[PDB]
Amino acid sequence: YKRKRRERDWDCNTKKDVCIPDRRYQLCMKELTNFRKLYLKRKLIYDAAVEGDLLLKLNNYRYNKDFCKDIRWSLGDFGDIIMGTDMEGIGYSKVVENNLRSIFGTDEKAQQRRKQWWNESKAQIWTAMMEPQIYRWIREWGRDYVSELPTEVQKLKEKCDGKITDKKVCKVPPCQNACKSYDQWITRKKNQWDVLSNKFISVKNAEKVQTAGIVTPYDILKQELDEFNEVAFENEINKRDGAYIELCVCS
Amino acid sequence: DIVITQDELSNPVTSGESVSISCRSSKSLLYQDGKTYLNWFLQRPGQSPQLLIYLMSTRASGVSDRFSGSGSGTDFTLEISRVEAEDVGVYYCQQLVEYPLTFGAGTKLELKRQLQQSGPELVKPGASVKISCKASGYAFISSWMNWVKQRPGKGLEWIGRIYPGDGDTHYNGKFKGKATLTADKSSSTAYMQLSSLTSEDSAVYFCAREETATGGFDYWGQGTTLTV
Asked: Which fold is adopted by the domain A132-251?
C-alpha cells in the first residue's frame, strides 16, 4: 500500500543535511529486520518482492516509464542499506544496518565485502521486483518538479486571470490566497534543491567521483529530461520566471 | 460593498426539530474556477466564532456531520438536523467574491424545553492601543491573520488581514485609516493598533487564522474588549 506520490514531499527536517523522498521513507525492508550471505539474499528477496509489487499497484497496474523509475530508485536504495552507504537511516533503517553488520562483519575490510555481495546479487534482486545515493535522488527530485510544475501553475491560472486593466492578484480574495499557496510550493522546492544540491557537491568533492558527465547539480536533470533549460529552471525556482510575474505580481 | 442578509428564527426551536438557516447575497459568489465561496459559522452564546460549513456544501473538520451546506450560489441554506442544545446561538455567513469580506446580520436560535489575544483595554477617546494575537503554530508565517470587529449586539465587521510571510495587507475600506496591521514574526504575534479612537470604536475584536492552502477561519481568540 504505497501512498499516491505527491501526497508526501521530501522531508528536510529529520536530517537537515539532505532531504529524503517519501518513496524511500516507505521502502519495504520488513524482512531484512528479521553461510548467512545466501540467507540474507532470501530475506532481501521478499522485501524486493513486496516493494516492486506494491509500486506497480501504486502506478495503477500500468507499464510506463514512471513505473521503471520507481523500481530503479527503490532498487538502489536497497544497495545503500546493504553496502552501508545509505544516508536515510532513521528509525528501523538504522536497525537493518546493524543487522547486516553481524551478518557481514564489522572489520575494516568488511566494508569491502558488502559491495562485492551486492555486485553479484543486484542482477537477481532487480528481477525479484518485477551510482551514489544522492545522484539518484537528484534524478527523482527532477522528475518531481517537472510533473508538479504544471499542476501548481494550473491551479493558479484558474483562480488568477483576466483584467476584470489590472490583474486579479489585487482586490480579489480567492486569487490572493492562490498566489500564496503557490509561494509555499516554490519556496519548499527552492529550499529543497538548496539542501539536496549541497549534498551532491559535498559528495562529489569529498569522495572521489569518477562520473564527469555530471559535475553540477544541474547536469543530472539535463541528462534525465529533454526540454530542461538551465536558465529557465533558475528563474522559476527564484519566482522571477515569465509566469509568476504575469500571475501574482500586481505591479 | 456587497449585500448579505439572513432571516430570523420565528419560533423557539424544539430539540431534535430540524431547521434550516437561509443566506442570500447580492452577487454571484461563484468564481472563475467555478467554486462558490462562502462560509457558515456559529457563535456559542458566550464563545468565539467557529467555522461549520465552507465553500458551500464542504463541511469543516470537527463539525458535526448533521450541518448541511446546500446552495445554488446566490441562495444558500444551512441545515441543523436533530438540533442539539449546544448549537443554540447565532449563525453567520461570509462571502469572498470581492473585498470587503461581509458577515451577514446573523440568525438567532432558541432552546425550547488556539490564538492568544491581548487582554482588555480601556482608554480615553482619541487614543491608539495596539492589541496582540499570538499563534503558537508555525503556520503563523504561512497563514492569514484576519481581524474582526464585534460590536455589542451586532454582527461582524471585517477590518483586514495581513500575511506575515511577505507582509501583505488588505484593508477594509471603512477602516482604511483606522487600522494599523502589523505582525511579529520572531515571536509569531499579530498586532492591530486602532487609530485615534471614537466612541463607536468600543467593541470586542477577534483575530481569525486563515490557512493559505481550505482558506477557512478556524482559529479565533478569546477576544479583546475595548472601551472608550
From this structure: Methane Monooxygenase Hydroxylase; Chain G, domain 1 (1.20.58)
